Enzyme design. Sequence first.
Site, short mmCIF file in Angstrom:
data_model
loop_
_atom_site.label_atom_id
_atom_site.label_comp_id
_atom_site.label_asym_id
_atom_site.label_seq_id
_atom_site.Cartn_x
_atom_site.Cartn_y
_atom_site.Cartn_z
N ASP B 153 35.13 53.90 34.65
CA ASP B 153 36.51 54.37 34.50
C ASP B 153 36.61 55.48 33.46
O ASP B 153 36.46 55.23 32.26
CB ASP B 153 37.36 53.17 34.09
CG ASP B 153 38.84 53.41 34.20
OD1 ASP B 153 39.31 54.58 34.26
OD2 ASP B 153 39.54 52.38 34.22
N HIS B 180 35.54 57.93 37.64
CA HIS B 180 36.82 58.22 38.28
C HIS B 180 37.87 58.63 37.26
O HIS B 180 37.84 58.22 36.09
CB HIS B 180 37.29 57.03 39.19
CG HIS B 180 37.65 55.76 38.48
ND1 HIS B 180 38.83 55.59 37.78
CD2 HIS B 180 37.03 54.55 38.47
CE1 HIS B 180 38.90 54.35 37.33
NE2 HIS B 180 37.82 53.70 37.73
N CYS B 191 48.22 50.83 33.42
CA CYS B 191 47.55 50.22 34.56
C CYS B 191 48.31 50.57 35.84
O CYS B 191 49.54 50.54 35.86
CB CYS B 191 47.47 48.71 34.38
SG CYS B 191 46.56 47.85 35.68
N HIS B 193 48.98 49.01 38.38
CA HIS B 193 49.92 47.94 38.67
C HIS B 193 50.75 47.56 37.45
O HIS B 193 51.10 46.38 37.26
CB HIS B 193 49.14 46.76 39.24
CG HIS B 193 48.15 47.18 40.29
ND1 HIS B 193 46.80 47.26 40.05
CD2 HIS B 193 48.33 47.62 41.56
CE1 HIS B 193 46.18 47.71 41.13
NE2 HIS B 193 47.09 47.93 42.06
N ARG B 228 41.58 59.69 41.49
CA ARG B 228 42.56 58.63 41.69
C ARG B 228 43.96 59.20 41.51
O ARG B 228 44.23 59.93 40.54
CB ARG B 228 42.33 57.48 40.71
CG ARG B 228 43.53 56.55 40.61
CD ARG B 228 43.21 55.34 39.74
NE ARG B 228 44.37 54.96 38.94
CZ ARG B 228 44.44 53.85 38.21
NH1 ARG B 228 43.41 53.01 38.17
NH2 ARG B 228 45.55 53.58 37.52
N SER B 315 42.98 44.61 44.40
CA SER B 315 43.23 44.35 42.99
C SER B 315 43.59 42.88 42.73
O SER B 315 44.20 42.22 43.58
CB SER B 315 44.35 45.26 42.48
OG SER B 315 44.54 45.15 41.07
N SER B 317 45.67 42.07 40.46
CA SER B 317 47.11 42.13 40.18
C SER B 317 47.97 41.74 41.39
O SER B 317 49.20 41.95 41.36
CB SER B 317 47.51 43.54 39.72
OG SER B 317 46.61 44.07 38.76
MG MG Z 1 41.47 51.80 34.45
#
Ligand code: MG
EC number: 4.1.3.1
Lengths: 427, 427, 427, 427
Positions: B153, B180, B191, B193, B228, B315, B317
């Site tokens: 990340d 990413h 985040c 989400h 992303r 996810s 989430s």
């Molecule tokens: Mg992240």
Amino acid sequence: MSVVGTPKSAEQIQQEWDTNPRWKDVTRTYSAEDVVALQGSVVEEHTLARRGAEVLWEQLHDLEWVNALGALTGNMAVQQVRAGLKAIYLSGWQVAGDANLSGHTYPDQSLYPANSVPQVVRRINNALQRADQIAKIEGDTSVENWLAPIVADGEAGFGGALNVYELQKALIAAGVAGSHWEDQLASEKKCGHLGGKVLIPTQQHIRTLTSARLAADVADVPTVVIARTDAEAATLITSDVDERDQPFITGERTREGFYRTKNGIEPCIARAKAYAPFADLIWMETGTPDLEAARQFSEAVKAEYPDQMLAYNCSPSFNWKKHLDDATIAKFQKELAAMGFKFQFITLAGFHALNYSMFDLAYGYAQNQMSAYVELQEREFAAEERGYTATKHQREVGAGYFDRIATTVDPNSSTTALTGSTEEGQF
Amino acid sequence: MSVVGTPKSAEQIQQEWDTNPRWKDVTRTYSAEDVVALQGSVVEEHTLARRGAEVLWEQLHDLEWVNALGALTGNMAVQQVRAGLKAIYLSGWQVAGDANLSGHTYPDQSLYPANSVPQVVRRINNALQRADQIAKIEGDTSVENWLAPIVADGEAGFGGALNVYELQKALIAAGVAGSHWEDQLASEKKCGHLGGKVLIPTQQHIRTLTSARLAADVADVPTVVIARTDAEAATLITSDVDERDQPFITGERTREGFYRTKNGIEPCIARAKAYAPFADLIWMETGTPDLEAARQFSEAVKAEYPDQMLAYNCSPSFNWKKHLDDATIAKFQKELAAMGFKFQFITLAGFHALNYSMFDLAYGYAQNQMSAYVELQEREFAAEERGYTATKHQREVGAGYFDRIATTVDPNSSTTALTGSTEEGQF
Amino acid sequence: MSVVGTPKSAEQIQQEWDTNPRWKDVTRTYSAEDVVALQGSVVEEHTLARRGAEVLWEQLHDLEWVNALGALTGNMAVQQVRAGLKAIYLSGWQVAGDANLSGHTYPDQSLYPANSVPQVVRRINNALQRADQIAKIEGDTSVENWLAPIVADGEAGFGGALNVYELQKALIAAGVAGSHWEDQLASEKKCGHLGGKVLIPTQQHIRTLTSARLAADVADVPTVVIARTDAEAATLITSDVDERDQPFITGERTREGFYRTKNGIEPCIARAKAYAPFADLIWMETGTPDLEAARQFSEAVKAEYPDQMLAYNCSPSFNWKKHLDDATIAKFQKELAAMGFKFQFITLAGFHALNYSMFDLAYGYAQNQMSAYVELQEREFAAEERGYTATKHQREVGAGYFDRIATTVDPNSSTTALTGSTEEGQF
Amino acid sequence: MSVVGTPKSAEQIQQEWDTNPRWKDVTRTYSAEDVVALQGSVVEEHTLARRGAEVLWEQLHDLEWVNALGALTGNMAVQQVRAGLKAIYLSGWQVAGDANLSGHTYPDQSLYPANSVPQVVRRINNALQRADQIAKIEGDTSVENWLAPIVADGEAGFGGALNVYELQKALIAAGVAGSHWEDQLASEKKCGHLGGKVLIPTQQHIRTLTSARLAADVADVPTVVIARTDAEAATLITSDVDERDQPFITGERTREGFYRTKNGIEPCIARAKAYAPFADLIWMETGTPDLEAARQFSEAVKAEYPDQMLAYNCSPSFNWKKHLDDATIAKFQKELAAMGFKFQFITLAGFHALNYSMFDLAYGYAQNQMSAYVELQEREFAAEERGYTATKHQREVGAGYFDRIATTVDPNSSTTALTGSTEEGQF
Ligand SMILES: [Mg+2]
Ligand SMILES: [Mg+2]
Ligand SMILES: [Mg+2]
Ligand SMILES: [Mg+2]
Ligand SMILES: [Mg+2]
Ligand SMILES: [Mg+2]
Ligand SMILES: [Mg+2]
Ligand SMILES: [Mg+2]
């Protein structure tokens, strides 16, 4: 001017050692004036070290016994406290394997950098402080003390008495409540259940314990000091200079210059007695969990020091059902507590829980993709009756706490996190 | 006069870009001579970043799809590879929550120090390399590739294009295979989400993706670059300067100067198409797991870029037995794969396996003490049939490998570690 | 049941704000209750942060002015204090260039990990504590306060208000006395004397100053907060949203979406007045060392806030004898103090002293080998008449102090360090 | 199915050992197959370590001698190379005192964490790489090789042979060119010119040197291995087990179990001869700078090993003019070189240059304020004729290099740093 951090006088320290019951039967071969001479003109307060050590000492005297599990991440300690445990054990084995400052995986041979365990102590305290902060803004009263005391591995001190001193000081700065120290040669250090251990002379370990107490005294905190002996399995000692070790010296030498020594519970009892005036708790490393051997050690030491508290490693290096039945396993800790083993811990609990659960999840995911993850998620949903909260993962790591900081700074901010989340809508 | 590390010439770089199929449909708005100018007189080889990136790219074309689970410790990554997985996902959420260089627990808002994810990349590679070393001395050939590629990340880059460049460089130095990058404002990052996100202009994220490719080029490795977009849920954007964003600007502007913007899948499709020339994979953050929405996103991107590979976050989430039946859950990833989602991952898998397994263990320990640990030990024993090896924990962290080093240095050593151990004697 | 570290009540905090002259004309837009809500159930004491902030505040009122030099190693700070200085300045520029946690050399553009300056604060305090401890065992009373207050660079907070909060919190944990915060966009941060600077809206910087005060309040320490404006040379700003900023907005925008703004002393004066209620000290970055311009800025701000104290960077980015003659240079700081500039500092003094002294030594060494070193050593010997002590390098780094620890643990030790040293024999 | 990092075969390694002149007269008591067995299936390339080791070895044969100064910051190394030096010395003493990972000031007793010297190696290499990148874009060819080889202090290994192995491996990962290893007990380490030094048996240091070579071979780099003996001053040894040490044992023992031993040049010569098959350079620590004692050591070693290269510490722990006149000082290194001391170094040069320059600046500043700094800036300006460049501090730390990165990503960016700076307008 400015009196912040002014050191106590020698007389105040002496009076405390003379009258506080914490120091009953605690030998210090140095003076209160020796302590003050080392403190400079400002003594930093170590709040979490002070509070942790006082809480631990009182639980050792108020509870039937204090038990703990090895934690190697901050979230892992948070779950231990959430689930009801009242102390945290910080394993040096686990730090070597999966949480030290070199970044490497190591066996338990004092290979990692010496400030690794202090950094994990600080991490664990940070994580418990966050759980405590979250619970306060949530009005969650279900955990009485989030700041459970931490008992950490000082190994063989990573060198001489000065290395021991610096490690103890660093553990205190990080907020440790107690630390343990073992009578192995640091340069050949082994896990107590690994082979090829070399002992140091009895008096050299008394020097280690004296150095750990001195670092605590100079830092003005009542850290719990734990002495560990590895004489049950060690067949080597660096020197025959100490007259208390000579009964066990065979006279045979190795190519390196070590002395072969006769191992067993007898040198362990002799060393534990020698260490007792210098340790708050005494611990015998053992190759098998055996209630009868525990009693023999316990009774032999309390014949001389009836009030000496003991510590016991319920170790995962043992194969628990190929030397014990279910009924003995279930009473194991309770019986040990009655012999005076007041601090009991599973050293590698975190290593095994972490490794097994990721293997189990990853293997299922390898075969069945999301079906495997949904299984774990259902188990977490289930565990909510028992008090599990990490299902709501955004609040668990403090999203609500930082939303509170954000709206304190700016009540009209248009960028708050939990407002409009998938945790607010599906969970 | 040494020539070790001499940089390639601009002509060789350009040929590479022109003829190697890896760079088909990759836009670089800078020149090959611009890369050489930044390389000084020595280029460090980055073995693991090179090998990881090459293996990842081949896997994305040879397998039906590549999937992974979030890993936040070295041991976690080792168990994922032991369990059969062929890639490792390194979540920034999990780094914020339990593994960053501040030592604090954080929500997913780019609060941790910018070199935290590279440090976890390096740790995971160290752990895999030890697993590989142990396997070689043991003759274990049951895993063909211990050095599974790592996708990490990069968040919003922790600042401007220069912070992106330095993060990508540090990830490569650490051995990452792919990284990413998301089109969120770094100073307000959340985040996917989470709520109230702020997007940056389309061209600004093209600058980020260009800076990430430049760092990989200057480092001379073919890192997989993943774009992303957070536009499905974000209702704010920093500026209306970019004409591609203007169809979604309302014209309303908040107290802080952010512009309100119309969210949903249409801005995600527009942004994905703008990002495709600058990314090897494209990823839409989504607010629920939904095969039909993924289908619509996929077909809209592939109408203009048929060869564009996509990535999908399954996810945690989300509540899975909420929305979906067991049969949809069971086919979810295979279905996504047929739509071009060639990299699929569960971001917070490591957080949930770790937190649940320790809560579960600690809760039982708090009630039944050793009976709870024995249950775990017996599941571990049972898992040995499926390939689990961590029951033998000394071997697992390399005691046998370091015994091999010791006896290579001194064949006559009497302080080796596995001989006499409780692991040889009880396992 | 422990009461160690119990937080105070809102009632108590409110009364301190209402009655301590420290807080006269300090605006907090949040409540005492807001502070208590964020403190959990334990407040860690921050002894060095408290003492340093208190000493700093007293000095800013008791001395004609407080001056300091940039320090980037612990030894540099010890020499500054040994030489008579009463505060230490911790430059972010110097950290970027030679002392940050990435290990890289960076220009001053907020490229390094956000916890870099806290670690150097902790280092400096450790070094001063060691000098304090050494002084005590040697009976040296020539320095009244070894723990000089440290003023540290918060830059643009490395993101949003929450990043500011965490940086202030980390600075306080490390022992800082004051911190300064500048109204630049963090993702485009520049050295004040670099070009390409981008301001943020006036109100966004007030949010920064509020977040820093809040972190100090939650940490329960009276940290000195310093506001710095970059509006003298900056011609860009992120937004025209703030009505206080609109009079300088020119109407022209860049491809990134920034607004051109008219720079100079006039927006500096306006921003300084807006910041004055939220800052203990106000600092205008300027393009040349000019008493007249300093007077105009001072008179303008004090026309509204007569008691507002100011800070002045005597910068090495200035070519001093190109602007001033020797008489003006000699009076510069004393004239500034009479205008209200009570904290004055040379930001990059350590960088230049370190680089020049090593170039000069290494150049002579490359030519004349040992003759060049002996020259340095004789200047060192000569400086001992002025109070220089580092020529006896073993005692300077604590050999005598650690000898005292060693003989406190074991007075009969045959391995102490200073007995038998060449230092004891030749110095 | 990747070939990146494939290890060499045993036959290939053996052929190198047999035919590369680098390995003439180098004893390895382990086999080529033993090296391969420890390499896993991927060998990471260590470009800077390989290049540095190759440059160092060539220089030791091509130059009259190689000399260096101790460096403890990256900028110090840059200035040493800018001034014309061709190697960098990395002193553990200096790391203890002002640059270790604990953040504390320590005397030279192996107190700091064992990964501290590797981190400084990595920092110096980063600093030199940046100077090399700046020089490339500035068209500056005045320095032939910015990546001067680093020789770093491995002290006594911080434990046993496995600690030695891991330290050498970390030094190589950081890019060291050579490392030195001393025959002192690690837990009682002293600076060579402190008292209370304890030796280890001759064979135990051979074990150390073998472990260091083993780690370099497993890392596949030709690191220069340096053996240091402390037998000139040390009066203690851990054991009389080694027949080569017995001629100097007196018989009597300390309280701690150490053996008293006869010190002087005679045990140094015997140890140097035992170490020579295992060391690329040999170094005897001495009590005074004495050309005829140096001749005696040199003749004695070379009587048995005519090609053995030697190293010499020109120590600041000596008061130079209390022993030598100016003509002898002037010819000291040249004379040593004619005797075979091909690597010569001033260990604590960085400590003294740093502490003296900051004392002198701060002292003048405390009395005269800006007058003192302008005197320093004027000496800097006058040094530019000798090649000094740091007066332009922005370009010195890479502002122009990062501007080039920024304009490579976006040529039209409005936020570059050097255009508009006071460095462009005043220097
Ligand atoms: Mg992240
Ligand atoms: Mg341990
Ligand atoms: Mg006792
Ligand atoms: Mg593409
Ligand atoms: Mg700054
Ligand atoms: Mg004010
Ligand atoms: Mg040294
Ligand atoms: Mg040789």
